[PDB]
Design a protein around this motif. Structure first.
Motif, PDB file in Angstrom:
ATOM      1  N   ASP A   1       0.815  -1.253   0.000  1.00 19.53           N
ATOM      2  CA  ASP A   1       0.000   0.000   0.000  1.00 19.53           C
ATOM      3  C   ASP A   1       0.843   1.296   0.000  1.00 19.53           C
ATOM      4  O   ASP A   1       0.661   2.208  -0.779  1.00 19.53           O
ATOM      5  CB  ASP A   1      -0.973   0.034   1.165  1.00 19.53           C
ATOM      6  CG  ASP A   1      -2.054  -0.984   1.032  1.00 19.53           C
ATOM      7  OD1 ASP A   1      -2.282  -1.557  -0.054  1.00 19.53           O
ATOM      8  OD2 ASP A   1      -2.711  -1.178   2.042  1.00 19.53           O
TER       9      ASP A   1
ATOM     10  N   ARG B   1       1.248   4.065  -2.975  1.00 17.26           N
ATOM     11  CA  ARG B   1       0.964   5.447  -2.631  1.00 17.26           C
ATOM     12  C   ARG B   1       2.119   6.305  -3.086  1.00 17.26           C
ATOM     13  O   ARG B   1       1.875   7.255  -3.850  1.00 17.26           O
ATOM     14  CB  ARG B   1       0.782   5.632  -1.126  1.00 17.26           C
ATOM     15  CG  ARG B   1       0.343   7.043  -0.769  1.00 17.26           C
ATOM     16  CD  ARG B   1      -1.148   7.140  -0.526  1.00 17.26           C
ATOM     17  NE  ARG B   1      -1.947   6.866  -1.719  1.00 17.26           N
ATOM     18  CZ  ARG B   1      -3.274   6.899  -1.793  1.00 17.26           C
ATOM     19  NH1 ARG B   1      -4.032   7.206  -0.752  1.00 17.26           N
ATOM     20  NH2 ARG B   1      -3.871   6.601  -2.941  1.00 17.26           N
TER      21      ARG B   1
ATOM     22  N   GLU C   1      -6.728   0.527  12.263  1.00 15.40           N
ATOM     23  CA  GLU C   1      -7.370   1.783  11.882  1.00 15.40           C
ATOM     24  C   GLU C   1      -8.106   2.419  13.059  1.00 15.40           C
ATOM     25  O   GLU C   1      -8.106   3.638  13.218  1.00 15.40           O
ATOM     26  CB  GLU C   1      -8.350   1.528  10.719  1.00 15.40           C
ATOM     27  CG  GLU C   1      -8.980   2.762  10.075  1.00 15.40           C
ATOM     28  CD  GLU C   1      -8.085   3.457   9.068  1.00 15.40           C
ATOM     29  OE1 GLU C   1      -7.421   2.764   8.274  1.00 15.40           O
ATOM     30  OE2 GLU C   1      -8.055   4.705   9.076  1.00 15.40           O
TER      31      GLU C   1
ATOM     32  N   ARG D   1      -5.342  -0.587   6.317  1.00 16.42           N
ATOM     33  CA  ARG D   1      -6.729  -0.134   6.391  1.00 16.42           C
ATOM     34  C   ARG D   1      -7.615  -1.331   6.776  1.00 16.42           C
ATOM     35  O   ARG D   1      -8.454  -1.803   6.002  1.00 16.42           O
ATOM     36  CB  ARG D   1      -7.169   0.547   5.086  1.00 16.42           C
ATOM     37  CG  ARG D   1      -8.308   1.535   5.285  1.00 16.42           C
ATOM     38  CD  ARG D   1      -8.362   2.584   4.187  1.00 16.42           C
ATOM     39  NE  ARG D   1      -9.172   3.738   4.593  1.00 16.42           N
ATOM     40  CZ  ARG D   1      -9.570   4.726   3.797  1.00 16.42           C
ATOM     41  NH1 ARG D   1      -9.257   4.726   2.507  1.00 16.42           N
ATOM     42  NH2 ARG D   1     -10.297   5.714   4.295  1.00 16.42           N
TER      43      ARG D   1
ATOM     44  N   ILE E   1      -5.664   8.303   7.322  1.00 17.02           N
ATOM     45  CA  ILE E   1      -6.465   9.301   6.595  1.00 17.02           C
ATOM     46  C   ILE E   1      -5.573  10.199   5.721  1.00 17.02           C
ATOM     47  O   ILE E   1      -5.921  10.479   4.567  1.00 17.02           O
ATOM     48  CB  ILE E   1      -7.385  10.119   7.549  1.00 17.02           C
ATOM     49  CG1 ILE E   1      -8.560   9.245   8.016  1.00 17.02           C
ATOM     50  CG2 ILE E   1      -7.921  11.389   6.885  1.00 17.02           C
ATOM     51  CD1 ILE E   1      -9.126   9.617   9.370  1.00 17.02           C
ATOM     52  N   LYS E   2      -4.427  10.618   6.271  1.00 14.99           N
ATOM     53  CA  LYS E   2      -3.422  11.415   5.540  1.00 14.99           C
ATOM     54  C   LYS E   2      -2.843  10.681   4.329  1.00 14.99           C
ATOM     55  O   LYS E   2      -2.622  11.290   3.276  1.00 14.99           O
ATOM     56  CB  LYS E   2      -2.286  11.860   6.455  1.00 14.99           C
ATOM     57  CG  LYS E   2      -2.662  13.058   7.317  1.00 14.99           C
ATOM     58  CD  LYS E   2      -1.565  13.473   8.290  1.00 14.99           C
ATOM     59  CE  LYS E   2      -2.138  14.171   9.533  1.00 14.99           C
ATOM     60  NZ  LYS E   2      -1.054  14.582  10.459  1.00 14.99           N
TER      61      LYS E   2
ATOM     62  N   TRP F   1      -4.183   7.680   2.684  1.00 15.46           N
ATOM     63  CA  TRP F   1      -5.224   7.243   1.740  1.00 15.46           C
ATOM     64  C   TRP F   1      -6.012   8.384   1.065  1.00 15.46           C
ATOM     65  O   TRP F   1      -6.682   8.150   0.051  1.00 15.46           O
ATOM     66  CB  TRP F   1      -6.193   6.286   2.432  1.00 15.46           C
ATOM     67  CG  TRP F   1      -5.597   4.955   2.819  1.00 15.46           C
ATOM     68  CD1 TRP F   1      -4.933   4.661   3.973  1.00 15.46           C
ATOM     69  CD2 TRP F   1      -5.625   3.744   2.054  1.00 15.46           C
ATOM     70  NE1 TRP F   1      -4.544   3.344   3.981  1.00 15.46           N
ATOM     71  CE2 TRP F   1      -4.951   2.755   2.816  1.00 15.46           C
ATOM     72  CE3 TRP F   1      -6.149   3.395   0.797  1.00 15.46           C
ATOM     73  CZ2 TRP F   1      -4.789   1.433   2.369  1.00 15.46           C
ATOM     74  CZ3 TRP F   1      -5.987   2.073   0.348  1.00 15.46           C
ATOM     75  CH2 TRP F   1      -5.306   1.109   1.136  1.00 15.46           C
ATOM     76  N   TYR F   2      -5.900   9.598   1.619  1.00 13.19           N
ATOM     77  CA  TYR F   2      -6.728  10.784   1.268  1.00 13.19           C
ATOM     78  C   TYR F   2      -8.242  10.508   1.106  1.00 13.19           C
ATOM     79  O   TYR F   2      -8.912  11.100   0.244  1.00 13.19           O
ATOM     80  CB  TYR F   2      -6.127  11.626   0.115  1.00 13.19           C
ATOM     81  CG  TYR F   2      -5.793  10.884  -1.168  1.00 13.19           C
ATOM     82  CD1 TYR F   2      -6.775  10.641  -2.139  1.00 13.19           C
ATOM     83  CD2 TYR F   2      -4.489  10.446  -1.423  1.00 13.19           C
ATOM     84  CE1 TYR F   2      -6.470   9.972  -3.319  1.00 13.19           C
ATOM     85  CE2 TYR F   2      -4.175   9.779  -2.602  1.00 13.19           C
ATOM     86  CZ  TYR F   2      -5.163   9.542  -3.543  1.00 13.19           C
ATOM     87  OH  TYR F   2      -4.850   8.882  -4.710  1.00 13.19           O
ATOM     88  N   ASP F   3      -8.761   9.621   1.960  1.00 13.33           N
ATOM     89  CA  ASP F   3     -10.170   9.226   1.941  1.00 13.33           C
ATOM     90  C   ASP F   3     -10.721   9.038   3.357  1.00 13.33           C
ATOM     91  O   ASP F   3     -10.045   8.487   4.228  1.00 13.33           O
ATOM     92  CB  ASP F   3     -10.359   7.948   1.118  1.00 13.33           C
TER      93      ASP F   3
END
Lengths: 333, 302
Positions: free
Chosen positions: B68, B72, B200, B235, B297-298, B300-302
């Motif tokens: 992941d 990214r 998470e 996640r 959150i930072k 995955w930007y979701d």
């Protein structure tokens, strides 16, 4: 009220410490891994001194070099140190006449014999000295006193008995006694010249000497006039009281908080144990005054500086302090 | 060209090349051969190789997490619409630089996470992570006083492995069984743990008895620690106390046997909730509670 000059009596209680003071001076010796002078200088800074005087003769070179290395030769300091060089080993009276001949004393000056560590704020002392000076013109010097550890049965070196006023707090008599160590004398004779002028006589032995003085411009003139006076407490105070100059007054100040002058080894031991304990609330190792100090407080009164090295499975006790760069082996108590 | 075979070659190595950092380095090598200029040809074949890696996985979680972060970083490269060539050269170079970052992070943590162990404190340590043991070793290098208690973890016998690695250092130890681990929490100052993953939610993905440690410590009010390198974030949200990705048994009850062969089967990986962790330590500062989620959150930007 501002501008205050101080004189420190060093080279005063040497050889009173018997095995030491042979190569290095009296006041260089550390209480809590830091020189005795440093405590006194910290007391000066908290009081508000602008000009500092020191009396060095025996081992004077080592004192002067230590002042060179000190935090007060640097320009930002509130006070500047000037050393008085005199003949080797003389009484306090002889130094007083030397300073009056040089003539630097202006208004109200400070004199401390020995090195004293106290948490007592001096701003209150100065105000009450000034309030009492405004009461009557012929008023001379101020003396500090603190309450003793209930009974002074272990304190034999300082058997000073004080007779004091309840209203004006003026000292009447000073007396030394051999009592518990040497059972020989019992009698104390008091002058009955001041009976109805005071009325409220209070006789106490339960007070610790401090030998810290706030003094007027009269003092160095009196020392030159009467050159027979060698001491500042035993003969001088008694001499002032016993109608030498009629109408002259001297102060005695009572304070509830800790103030003990260093003089003997077993007194030094008690003061040190008081410092390890939290007797002197501001004066604690963790605050770090010498700047090189990096002491940190730990619970159960245990002091450790930075870079403390210790072996595993070792037990430490109560009211202990260990310096920096120190190594300890196993099985230690 | 193979990626699972490259990971299998690390047998006697390890320790320096951390399990995910060796898989990430294997991902970069597979990327740099067949041209990273094309985004349709390369990314799809990278995705197929990660899927082949997941299918070959028996009981590892961190390899999926590490993929992941790689992905990214690749996507973020040409986010400035930069030259399709200098952006590529920076992507290929960030493989050896990724492994070099594992050393720099370990240099950071071992000076930060020695502060938690105070003057003369008895520690009960559970699990084995390269970050937690590096704290323990570089505190002994700092010449600090600490006692150690070994937990008898039962995966491939980890307690015995931990005990031997503590002997090589010069720190006094004794074996404590995970059954009796409740009877130790009075002569223990602090409880430490090394995690296989961090949730998470803020919980933990760990070994054959870690939740049990977390609860007992919550009862005794004694602190509970998690120390790791900052790459073990997935996640993943394990909703219940006994739900995890598995290739083997999720609690199996066997029939009547006489020869005695089918027995062992128990949950080898267990989850613990967010409340049980007092403190968490990574190279990304000193942070514990909602911090993990903010990191995710930072990213995955979701």
């Amino acid at each position: 009220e501002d501008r205050l000059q101080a004189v420190v009596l060093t080279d005063s209680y040497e050889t009173r410490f018997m095995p030491l003071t042979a190569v290095k001076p009296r006041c260089l010796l550390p209480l809590a891994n830091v020189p005795l002078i440093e405590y006194t200088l910290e007391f000066l800074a908290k009081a508000g001194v602008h000009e500092v005087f020191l009396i060095c003769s025996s081992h004077a070179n080592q004192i002067n070099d230590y002042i060179e290395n000190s935090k007060w030769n640097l320009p930002w300091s509130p006070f500047k140190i000037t050393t008085i060089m005199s003949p080797e080993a003389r009484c306090t009276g002889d130094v007083m006449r030397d300073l009056d001949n040089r003539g630097i004393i202006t208004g109200d000056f400070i004199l401390v014999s020995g090195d004293v560590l106290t948490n007592i704020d001096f701003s209150k002392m100065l105000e009450f000295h000034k309030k009492m000076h405004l009461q009557d013109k012929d008023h001379i010097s101020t003396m500090c006193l603190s309450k003793a550890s209930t009974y002074p049965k272990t304190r034999t070196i300082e058997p000073a008995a004080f007779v004091l006023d309840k209203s004006t707090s003026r000292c009447i008599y000073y007396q030394d006694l051999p009592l518990p160590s040497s059972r020989e004398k019992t009698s104390i004779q008091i002058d009955p010249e001041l009976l109805d002028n005071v009325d409220e006589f209070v006789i106490r032995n339960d007070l610790i000497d401090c030998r810290i003085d706030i003094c007027t411009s009269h003092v160095p003139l009196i020392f030159q006039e009467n050159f027979d006076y060698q001491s500042l407490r035993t003969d001088f105070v008694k001499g002032v009281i016993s109608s030498d100059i009629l109408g002259k007054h001297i102060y005695a100040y009572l304070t509830d908080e800790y103030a003990v002058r260093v003089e003997s080894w077993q007194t030094y031991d008690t003061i040190s144990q008081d410092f390890l304990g939290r007797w002197c609330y501001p004066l604690v190792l963790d605050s770090n005054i010498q700047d090189d100090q990096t002491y940190s407080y730990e619970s159960r009164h245990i002091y450790k500086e930075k870079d403390v090295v210790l072996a595993q499975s070792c037990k430490i006790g109560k009211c202990t302090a260990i310096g920096s760069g120190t190594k300890i082996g196993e099985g230690t108590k | 060209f193979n990626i699972t075979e490259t990971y299998l070659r690390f047998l006697e190595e390890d320790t320096e090349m951390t399990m995910p950092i060796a898989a990430i380095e294997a991902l970069v090598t597979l990327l740099r051969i067949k041209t990273p200029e094309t985004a349709a040809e390369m990314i799809n074949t990278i995705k197929s190789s990660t899927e082949e890696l997941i299918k070959s996985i028996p009981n590892s979680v961190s390899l999926r997490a590490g993929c992941d972060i790689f992905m990214r970083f690749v996507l973020r490269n040409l986010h400035l619409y930069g030259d399709w060539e200098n952006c590529k050269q920076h992507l290929i170079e960030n493989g050896q630089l990724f492994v070099s970052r594992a050393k720099k992070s370990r240099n950071k943590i071992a000076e930060i996470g020695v502060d938690f162990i105070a003057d003369d404190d008895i520690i009960l340590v559970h699990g084995y992570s390269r970050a937690v043991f590096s704290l323990l070793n570089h505190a002994a290098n700092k010449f600090i006083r600490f006692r150690c208690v070994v937990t008898e973890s039962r995966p491939s016998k980890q307690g015995n492995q931990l005990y031997t690695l503590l002997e090589q250092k010069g720190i006094p130890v004794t074996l404590i069984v995970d059954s009796a681990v409740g009877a130790v929490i009075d002569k223990v100052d602090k409880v430490f743990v090394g995690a296989e993953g961090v949730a998470e939610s803020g919980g933990i993905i760990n070994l054959v008895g870690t939740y049990s440690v977390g609860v007992l410590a919550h009862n005794a009010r004694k602190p509970f620690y998690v120390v790791t390198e900052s790459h073990k974030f997935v996640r993943m949200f394990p909703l219940s106390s006994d739900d995890l990705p598995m290739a083997g048994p999720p609690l199996d009850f066997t029939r009547r046997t006489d020869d005695l062969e089918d027995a062992l089967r128990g949950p080898t990986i267990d989850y613990t909730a967010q409340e049980y962790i007092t403190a968490l330590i990574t190279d990304l500062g000193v942070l514990t509670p909602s911090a993990v989620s903010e990191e995710l959150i930072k990213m995955w930007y979701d």
